[PDB]
Amino acid sequence: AQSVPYGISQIKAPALHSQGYTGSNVKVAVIDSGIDSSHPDLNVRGGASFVPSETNPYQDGSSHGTHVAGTIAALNNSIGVLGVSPSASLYAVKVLDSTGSGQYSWIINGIEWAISNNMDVINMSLGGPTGSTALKTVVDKAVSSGIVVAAAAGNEGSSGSTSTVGYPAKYPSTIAVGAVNSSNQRASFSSAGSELDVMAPGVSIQSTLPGGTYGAYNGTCMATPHVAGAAALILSKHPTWTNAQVRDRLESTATYLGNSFYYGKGLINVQAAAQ
């Protein structure tokens, strides 16, 4: 039997599925530690690896990329879980090794791959506290090319009025994604700052793990794929909408939660956004 993780219901993705919209033909790059494409609850259509010591993108020694992939597009069937956009085409763009670490140049190579292979959506459930000119340039280019880029805001919590939002989420072109629990409360680890754009479920998020298993993790990284999948749903229903239009709808129709320093525009509502 299939379970529907609470976060998937929380952003109102099932309403889109009932309308007949599930992310079909929308190409989503998972720029992460790889995706174990042997998982029976996942379909992976392609990808590439820029991690020098781990050149097969369909192997994931961290589990992070597989878990993110399942929140985005775990298959709608009789097993495991359900992703936000279960018919989306997933691409394994491996830029982190099995420890979940990656050089910025590898990440850039992964983003450039996404550009060159006409991805519709990029998910980056990763960041660091350091900025990079090359990184900004590449993310800005992906966005000016028409690609939706969702980035984890970071898990550095709050520090008085100083922004703890990491990179590349800090840059204006990306959609920075914070984390809320099932009560719509900000998780205390979720980074804060005026760069925050939206929140999504990021506490106790059940999804796919390598080896055909399932498990829950917490993080703005688990929150991010909710937003990448939301984008996939919206574009499967509005295939002419640009990335800026997708973003504007996700933010303008978000459920207000409070002070935008801690919550951005609030919790995404994919049902409202895709009206």
């Binding site: 992460d32 530690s33 961290s62 992070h64 982190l96 979940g100 670490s101 990656g102 050089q103 910025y104 140049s105 990440i107 850039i108 190579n109 450039e112 550009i115 060159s116 459930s125 990763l126 960041g127 660091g128 350091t130 990079s132 000119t133 090359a134 340039t137 590449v138 280019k141 984890a152 805001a153 970071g154 898990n155 990491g166 990179y167 989420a169 993080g219 703005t220 990284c221 991010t224």
Partner: protein
């Protein structure tokens, strides 16, 4: 040596697949990759190479190739 990203000025030289390589390669630097969409290159550099590069009319910046982590 360290892991760096070397960026180039829009047209004030070096972009070209070869003068880019050349630019870094002839300061001790070593190139692992030339970015397709970014006017930059991932390279390995000693301290001398950094100083020379930063001061090249073709170079806009010399930044450390930082290490991110799963968020």
């Amino acid at each position: 040596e360290k892991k760096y990203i070397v960026g180039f000025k829009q047209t004030m030289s070096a972009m070209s697949s070869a003068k880019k390589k050349d630019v870094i390669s002839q300061k001790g630097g070593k190139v692992e990759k030339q970015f397709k969409y970014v006017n930059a290159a991932a390279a390995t550099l000693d301290e001398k190479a950094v100083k020379e590069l930063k001061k090249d009319p073709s170079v806009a910046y010399v930044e450390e190739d930082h290490i991110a982590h799963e968020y």
